[PDB]
Amino acid sequence: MKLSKDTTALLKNFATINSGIMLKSGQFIMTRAVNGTTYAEANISDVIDFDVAIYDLNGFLGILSLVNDDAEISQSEDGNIKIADARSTIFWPAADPSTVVAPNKPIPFPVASAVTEIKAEDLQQLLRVSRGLQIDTIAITVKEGKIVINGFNKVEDSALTRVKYSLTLGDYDGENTFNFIINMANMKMQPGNYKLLLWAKGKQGAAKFEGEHANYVVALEADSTHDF
């Protein structure tokens, strides 16, 4: 099997969520954080033809950049990964599945309670500014008829009442109010535009980001509230 640069670029983004991954045969890849607060999934154009666990995904992808694009990836005789080039061969170790945290199945995200979106340059600003503004917590809420994202420094503001960054996502014409709180460490989506699906029921809740190439599911913090 071959891996195009569009697939390896996605796998590189998935490596920021989990250092390892479980590849299974088909045209679908997915991963989850070790603590289970972040999930990612994507349909790829390449075809995976065998199941293998990769402990150091980022190191595996770096080696793929050192061979030709038409290099063949197959399972070696001893059960590891064989990368055949024109005049060379690379052997990457196949991890034991017990050392890689992988999701048991793809996430069936329920019907969203509220639907919005975020533009690429807005998502880019939110991510890049969070380091300079010491923002580790965002809240997706409704303020004066609009869905906004407020950034907070949870260390110096446990009550989340000092807005350091505010981003207006769009209009919201619904009587339902909510304040979905997300840890900034879980905003691992690659650059681009995303359709934002917000779901909450009882003390459970999650947010789904639908992009052009992948989906991201992020758990909500316990301080989140909603009234439907």
Partner 1 sequence: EPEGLDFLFDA
Query: Which residues in this chain contact its own copies in the complex, by CB under 8 A?
Result: 59, 62-63, 66-68, 85, 87-92, 121-122, 125, 128-129, 132-133, 162-168
CB nearer to partner 1: pick between 119 and 154: 154
Q: Is 173 helix (H, G, I), strand (E, B) or coil?
A: coil
Binding partner selected for residue 72 from its own copies, partner 1, none, CB under the kind-specific 5 to 8 Å limit: none
State residue 213 phi and psi, 5-degree precision. -125, -25
Work out whether 37 is an interface residue with partner 1 (CB under 8 A).
Answer: yes
CB nearer to its own copies: pick between 96 and 227: 96
CB nearer to its own copies: pick between 132 and 202: 132
Q: Using a CB cutoff of 8 Å and minimum separation of 24, what contacts does 104-109 make?
A: 106/28, 106/30, 106/41, 107/39, 107/41, 107/217, 109/197, 109/199, 109/206, 109/208, 109/217
Contact by Cβ (8 Å): 225, 202? no
CB of 166 to its own copies, least distance (A): 4
CB of 104 to its own copies, least distance (A): 31
CB of 213 to partner 1, least distance (A): 21
Q: Is 12 helix (H, G, I), strand (E, B) or coil?
A: helix
Binds partner 1 by CB under 8 A, chosen from 36, 59, 62, 174: 36
Work out whether 206 is an interface residue with partner 1 (CB under 8 A).
Answer: yes
Kindly provide the b/e burial profile for residues 146-172, where b requires at least 16 CB atoms within 10 angstroms of the residue's own CB. Answer: ebbbbbbbbeeeeebeeebbebebeeb
Binds partner 1 by CB under 8 A, chosen from 39, 92, 178, 194: 39
- The backbone region for 134, taken as left when phi is positive above 0, alpha when psi lies in -120 to 50, beta otherwise, is left
Work out whether 165 is an interface residue with partner 1 (CB under 8 A).
Answer: no
Q: Token pair 């609009």 is at which residue?
A: 146
Contact by Cβ (8 Å): 228, 176? yes
Binds partner 1 by CB under 8 A, chosen from 16, 19, 93, 103: 103
Structure tokens at 190: 């690659």
CB nearer to its own copies: pick between 87 and 203: 87
Residues making contact with partner 1 (CB under 8 A): 32-33, 35-39, 103-105, 107-109, 203-204, 206, 217, 219, 222
